Write a protein that binds this ligand. Structure first.
Ligand SMILES: Nc1ncnc2c1ncn2[C@@H]1O[C@H](COP(=O)(O)O)[C@@H](O)[C@H]1O
Ligand SMILES: Nc1ncnc2c1ncn2[C@@H]1O[C@H](COP(=O)(O)O)[C@@H](O)[C@H]1O
Ligand SMILES: [Cl-]
Ligand SMILES: [Cl-]
Ligand SMILES: [Cl-]
Ligand SMILES: [Mg+2]
Ligand SMILES: [Mg+2]
Ligand SMILES: [Mg+2]
Lengths: 358, 356
């Protein structure tokens, strides 16, 4: 048990498509800020917590599956839900949290600290801290601006350094002091533009599916990534105005290196895509989705690649990522976007470990 | 038990927000077409079947609760899901049906005939047949054109009479023979344009919520139905091209009367709205929504109507219905729209009784 010799904390990422428990060991520097954060336990379950029947047996059984076989129980627990919960009104969210609190009260060891729906802006903050912790970029003052994107099921986040800015909402900015350095960041989350939610607007778009993919309306896929992308852009910009909100700011605060986490790490890492050095460009991403999924015959492709439950979405997802990043945020199609490998289990929960101590 | 003396079948509408079991008794006419269709049992459960965990304990307990206390047994069952299921790929849908087929196989008191996801066009056909059955307009050749809309959680349907084209997808045309007469219909379903799916695009729009309603991003409602309606219209037309697809067809094949079923019956029936004769106009709906919800203070309104689980959405909903029927379908904002009262339990399931 590492927790006999180190501080330990459990943090649950209750995301829109599933929940992930992490138990971290850590030490602390002279200011009691965590260092040496190591993941000592990970368990993931599907589907998302906000998706399940809000009754007591359903909620208790889910929590049981997530938590009951954890090797270490007598530690602080944070259960933080993101955009899956944000789709529900507060009265309906309360049902899940009242049951969750009771479940925890009936367990011996666990110290529930907080169980709540975090704002998209806090999610963004935790996204940035988690990625910069992993990159080892927090302990000294950086020459260069690191931006972070998190592609979730129901929201997406974008977060990048920006000096305190009176022209921008207080709610879209965060100042923090960590490892003795002061950092101001712009933060934004877009609810409804996550992959699952976005996809439900385009399931009958033949451009967004491989040739002869059976669309729900009985028609056939006729894939064309540029056309699928255009359709997605209409939701990004004509509907949500992502371009108007993000591009003028990004122009004035250029990012030197972009890191992405969430569904895009899984796509980019799949067997259908070819990228080197865990990094991609949007131009390459759209060209590979177009050639390798959109223009392929669905029954043939599905037989060639049997193991990937997401295969059928890859024409649409490659088009959406481009739509979001290039037409929405205004990122150059030829700009390198780093993604973190899925095996690293990096989500924004490390940000919680660090942020509570500041 | 009328099923000793008359044909009966059970039809389950598995919608995006709930499932409704109907048992119907009926006789058959000269050609074995049903007549004298009567609903003899209704039971509804929430939430939608496609929203629950697709495992044995969960599926089995849902179906047990839906069928428990049914006063009649040992009859054929049709389980037909709509857009909630169409959101899922066939591989995930199969996890639900594999378990549901097995559960039924073990129940000696129910004979499962078919359990499947119907297309939005099938659903639009059944929507039209169900309303026109209730209106008594199928047995004889009709002089007027009757149009039907179904406002669901994940898709919306529109269906109205239309001559053979050749250039229109065969998938959007249906030739129906019933009571010995021939009827040609245009059908269309718009997936993602149902109430729940649409609403997930606008939860941070202040124009769409009563004053001070807490939005998930921490901003406050500031209701303005005309503005909210313009936002929703961008999803209708800029994204979905509803107007380009529907408006030309209605100009070429006019509808004399409109009937709507689904969530709009519930909204129109709310104590906040005032409509007579089970009919509304889009102008009136948008004005009442704007006046009675958008422009009201949320805490006051929530405390005044504590029972109503849909209230927080009524400003959005008023705006969305207008955006859909006027900006989308091209309906005059002063045209009468009949809605079927909710207590009638009318969904498209009557359509399945009539047309297998
Ligand atoms: N192979 C994959 N390709 C694309 N997206 C994926 C893959 N696996 C998981 N995801 C997405 O990753 C996102 C994680 O979001 P969340 O559950 O909201 O934290 C969801 O939208 C998942 O569906
Ligand atoms: N009381 C209500 N007020 C407004 N809409 C409702 C109400 N009850 C049910 N609905 C909607 O009725 C529609 C039924 O669609 P479905 O469940 O897809 O058959 C869904 O959008 C429901 O959310
Ligand atoms: Cl469930
Ligand atoms: Cl469909
Ligand atoms: Cl939000
Ligand atoms: Mg997430
Ligand atoms: Mg329905
Ligand atoms: Mg049986």
């Amino acid at each position: 048990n590492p927790c006999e010799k180190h501080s330990c904390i459990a943090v649950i990422d209750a995301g829109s498509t599933g929940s992930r428990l992490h138990i971290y060991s850590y030490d602390t520097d002279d200011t009691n800020t965590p260092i040496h954060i190591e993941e000592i336990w990970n368990k993931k379950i599907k589907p998302g917590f906000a998706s399940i029947q809000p009754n007591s047996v359903t909620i208790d059984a889910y929590l049981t599956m997530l938590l009951a076989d954890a090797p270490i129980h007598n530690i602080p627990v944070y259960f933080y839900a993101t955009a899956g919960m944000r789709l529900l009104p507060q009265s309906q969210q309360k049902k899940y949290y009242d049951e969750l609190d009771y479940w925890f009260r009936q367990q011996s060891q666990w110290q529930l600290v907080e169980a709540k729906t975090i704002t998209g802006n806090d999610e963004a903050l935790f996204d940035w801290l988690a990625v910069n912790y992993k990159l080892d970029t927090l302990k000294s003052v950086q020459n260069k601006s690191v931006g972070v994107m998190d592609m979730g099921g129901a929201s997406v986040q974008i977060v990048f350094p920006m000096p305190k800015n009176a022209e921008i909402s207080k709610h879209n900015q965060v100042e923090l002091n960590i490892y003795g350095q002061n950092i101001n960041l712009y933060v934004h989350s877009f609810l409804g533009l996550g992959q699952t939610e976005m996809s439900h607007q385009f399931l009958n778009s033949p451009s967004c599916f491989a040739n002869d993919y059976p669309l729900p309306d009985g028609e056939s896929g006729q894939g064309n990534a540029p056309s699928c992308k255009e359709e997605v852009t209409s939701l990004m910009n004509s509907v949500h105005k992502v371009n108007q909100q993000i591009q003028p700011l990004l122009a004035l605060n250029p990012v030197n290196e972009w890191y992405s986490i969430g569904g895009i790490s899984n796509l980019a890492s799949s067997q259908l895509f070819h990228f080197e050095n865990s990094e991609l460009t949007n131009q390459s991403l759209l060209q590979q989705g177009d050639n390798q999924i959109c223009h392929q015959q669905w029954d043939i492709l599905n037989g060639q690649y049997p193991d990937d439950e997401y295969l059928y979405q890859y024409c649409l997802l490659s088009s959406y990522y481009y739509a979001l990043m290039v037409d929405g945020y205004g990122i150059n199609p030829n700009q390198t976007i780093h993604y973190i490998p899925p095996e690293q289990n990096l989500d924004w929960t490390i940000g919680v470990v660090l942020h509570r101590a500041l």
